[PDB]
Amino acid sequence: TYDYLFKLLLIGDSGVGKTCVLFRFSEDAFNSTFISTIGIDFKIRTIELDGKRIKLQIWDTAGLERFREITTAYYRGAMGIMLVYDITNEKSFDNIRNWIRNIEEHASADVEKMILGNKCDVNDKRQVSKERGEKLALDYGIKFMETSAKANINVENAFFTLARDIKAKMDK
Ligand SMILES: Nc1nc2c(ncn2[C@@H]2O[C@H](COP(=O)(O)OP(=O)(O)OP(=O)(O)O)[C@@H](O)[C@H]2O)c(=O)[nH]1
Ligand SMILES: [Mg+2]
């Protein structure tokens, strides 16, 4: 079985790497061919924290605008949300502010939030400095990490940290 079940959501503009982050976390693999998510998808992985078994039910939203009705319906049950942008795409970083408004208008007001700056293996095409990502997350009081699904950087750490913070809030 499991001791806790945490429903998690990945949100962010299309193309930032939500599906590849989840594929790395659930299957420890990376595919370079862009296959945009249609509607929604999910993966399930159970981790251990403090000797407790935490089942992570992770919903991978479709970032394309025409799927917003489906994304919105998945906000209510969520306990933690990854807000993903692409360090090579300034617009996806700008839009983190709008994804935050979306979360706070629909999700439970207590939902745990974390910002991921993905594709940090592509330093040659970086547009969003790490300093600016840290500052935005500081402005919102949110944790922040740069990740790479391709090189498997901070993917484990992002999900384990988010789960730990959800568990800490529950255990208090
Ligand atoms: N170099 C590099 N490329 C990445 C990384 N993560 C994702 N990509 C590439 O970025 C493209 C988009 O990745 P996806 O995971 O499909 O993006 P998404 O956010 O799920 O997009 P939608 O499903 O349309 O919302 C794909 O071609 C990936 O291979 C990464 O960490 N590093
Ligand atoms: Mg996807």
Residue numbers in the entry: 4 to 175
Anything the authors wrote about it?
Parkinson’s-disease-associated LRRK2 kinase phosphorylates Rab8a and Rab10 to subvert their membrane trafficking functions in the formation of primary cilia. Rab8a is phosphorylated at a threonine (pT72) and subsequently binds to a phosphospecific effector (RILPL2) via its C-terminal RH2 domain. The C-terminal RH2 domain of RILPL2 encodes a Rab-binding domain (RBD) that adopts a parallel α-helical coiled-coil structure. Here, we show that recognition of pT72 involves a dual arginine motif involving R130 and R132 from the RH2 domain of RILPL2.
In addition to complexes, we also determined the structure of uncomplexed Rab8TE. This was performed to support the hypothesis that thermodynamic parameters can be attributed to complex formation rather than intrinsic structural changes from the negative charge at switch 2. The structure of Rab8TE reveals no significant conformational differences in the overall fold relative to the complex Rab8TE:RL2129. Although the structure of uncomplexed pRab8a-pT72 has not yet been determined, it is likely that phosphorylated Rabs do not undergo significant conformational changes upon complex formation with RILPL2.
